[PDB]
Amino acid sequence: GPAKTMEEASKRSYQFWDTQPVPKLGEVVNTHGPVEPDKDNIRQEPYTLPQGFTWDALDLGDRGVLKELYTLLNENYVEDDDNMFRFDYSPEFLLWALRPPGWLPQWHCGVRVVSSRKLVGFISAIPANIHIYDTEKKMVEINFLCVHKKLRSKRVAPVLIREITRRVHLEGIFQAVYTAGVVLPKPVGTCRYWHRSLNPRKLIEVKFSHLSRNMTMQRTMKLYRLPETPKTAGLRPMETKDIPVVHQLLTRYLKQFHLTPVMSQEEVEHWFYPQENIIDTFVVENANGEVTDFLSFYTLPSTIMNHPTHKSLKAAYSFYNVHTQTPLLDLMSDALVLAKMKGFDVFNALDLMENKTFLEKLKFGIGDGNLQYYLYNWKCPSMGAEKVGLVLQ
Amino acid sequence: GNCFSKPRVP
Numbered sequence: 001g002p003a004k005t006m007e008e009a010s011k012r013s014y015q016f017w018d019t020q021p022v023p024k025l026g027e028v029v030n031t032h033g034p035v036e037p038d039k040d041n042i043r044q045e046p047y048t049l050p051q052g053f054t055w056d057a058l059d060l061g062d063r064g065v066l067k068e069l070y071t072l073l074n075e076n077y078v079e080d081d082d083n084m085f086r087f088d089y090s091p092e093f094l095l096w097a098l099r100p101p102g103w104l105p106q107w108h109c110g111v112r113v114v115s116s117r118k119l120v121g122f123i124s125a126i127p128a129n130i131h132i133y134d135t136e137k138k139m140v141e142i143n144f145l146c147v148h149k150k151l152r153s154k155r156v157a158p159v160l161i162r163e164i165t166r167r168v169h170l171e172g173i174f175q176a177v178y179t180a181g182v183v184l185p186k187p188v189g190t191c192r193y194w195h196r197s198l199n200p201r202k203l204i205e206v207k208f209s210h211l212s213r214n215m216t217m218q219r220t221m222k223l224y225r226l227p228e229t230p231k232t233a234g235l236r237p238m239e240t241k242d243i244p245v246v247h248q249l250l251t252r253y254l255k256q257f258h259l260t261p262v263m264s265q266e267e268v269e270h271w272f273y274p275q276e277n278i279i280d281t282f283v284v285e286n287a288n289g290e291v292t293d294f295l296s297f298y299t300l301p302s303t304i305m306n307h308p309t310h311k312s313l314k315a316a317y318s319f320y321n322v323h324t325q326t327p328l329l330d331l332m333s334d335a336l337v338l339a340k341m342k343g344f345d346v347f348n349a350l351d352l353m354e355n356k357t358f359l360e361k362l363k364f365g366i367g368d369g370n371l372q373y374y375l376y377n378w379k380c381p382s383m384g385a386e387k388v389g390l391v392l393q
Numbered sequence: 394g395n396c397f398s399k400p401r402v403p
């Protein structure tokens with residue numbers, strides 16, 4: 001099944017995605033708007049699962065249920081291209097990603113074995129207001145689509161997708177945004193992960209990265225060495241009093257991109273207020289007391305699959321970085337120093353927004369995984385990575 | 394969902 005490049009995606013047919021309100025691969029789009037109308041009748045009954053499986057909405061406020069979801073994902077969610085590392089989203093992270101303002105329990109859509117109640121599938125929706133070119137639309141973000149390794153290739157993923165679609169339709173929402181490492185009809189933008197080594201000794205030892213064979217280990221560590229403390233004047237962790245100005249800075253900064261979130265002040269608090277081992281946000285408060293810039297990154301460690309009891313690969317993911325007075329190059333240099341100080345092994349960033357202006361300069365290396373962005377039921381021109389201004393978890 | 398990437402090898 002899965003195609004990872006648009007060349008190989010052109011050489012195949014999509015039994016499920018051809019039935020969905022998305023553009024065809026290779027269709028060049030010059031219009032802007034829905035593929036199909038809002039529905040004034042929505043199917044009241046859940047879609048049929050294969051015999052022996054049943055739907056269950058996951059109440060994550062139940063500690064036992066949250067652990068079941070953590071375990072499903074820890075054992076069956078996204079792996080790297082070589083099946084050496086698997087995302088290890090923490091339970092507290094999952095609460096952050098899955099209970100933002102406006103979350104709904106019916107949108108934490110699980111699949112369980114009927115007889116044993118074992119959790120074997122999941123998909124989620126959370127609400128988001130999305131600015132796409134000249135339109136703002138209430139949408140959902142879809143995330144954490146996961147089918148147990150023992151249930152794979154049994155066409156359960158289309159049922160999960162149709163069911164969350166139905167459950168979102170019931171709430172009057174008819175567009176969605178989502179990302180995937182695979183190519184489907186039809187990316188609105190294609191982004192690439194880059195990686196900045198922070199602890200190269202460990203990255204090479206777990207074979208996340210490789211010694212250039214013309215470089216010694218000693219020389220690699222000198223290459224990637226960073227200052228012990230950040231250089232930007234007035235940098236400090238975001239505090240409650242910074243919520244309004246962070247909201248103001250973000251809103252004005254995102255206007256320059258073509259696919260962005262539109263966050264309320266309560267949403268800004270949720271996504272940026274620091275939570276240890278989940279989300280870090282630092283603001284620049286200058287000599288006048290004014291907050292002029294901020295950087296942020298989230299915590300997403302990964303199981304080392306070939307050595308399971310060893311300490312996970314600790315990765316920080318660039319989130320939103322807003323500059324109005326500090327040069328973005330300096331802000332991101334301080335992001336690296338802070339991630340290093342907090343024990344991260346690698347700092348990851350996509351090539352979206354203005355990130356290409358600093359990636360090579362700050363010694364990021366290009367990754368092997370593309371991140372495709374998609375809209376459901378919204379046909380619009382595609383855009384280059386540097387116009388994508390949306391980062392998901 | 395998100396995707397897992399690692400440094401491209403020459």
Ligand SMILES: CC(C)(COP(=O)(O)OP(=O)(O)OC[C@H]1O[C@@H](n2cnc3c(N)ncnc32)[C@H](O)[C@@H]1OP(=O)(O)O)[C@@H](O)C(=O)NCCC(=O)NCCS
Nearest residue numbers: 014015016017077078146147152153154155156157180394
């Ligand atoms: C992704 C996953 C749920 C797909 O389940 P599967 O058993 O492998 O595939 P199924 O037989 O159930 O269904 C295949 C259909 O789902 C599509 N599909 C596969 N992966 C998809 C994805 N990430 N997102 C959306 N659709 C996807 C396929 O293109 C195919 O549809 P098509 O006929 O139009 O081509 C499953 O492989 C999994 O859990 N992988 C690890 C976690 C993961 O990658 N989650 C998605 C992150 S974007």
Ligand SMILES: *C(=O)CCCCCCCCCCCCC
Nearest residue numbers: 143144145168174175176376394
């Ligand atoms: C990562 O986990 C993303 C997996 C995306 C699967 C496709 C989702 C399609 C949109 C479904 C909701 C539609 C709401 C109107």
Ligand SMILES: [Cl-]
Nearest residue numbers: 059060061105
């Ligand atoms: Cl919940």
Ligand SMILES: [Cl-]
Nearest residue numbers: 028029381382
């Ligand atoms: Cl296009």
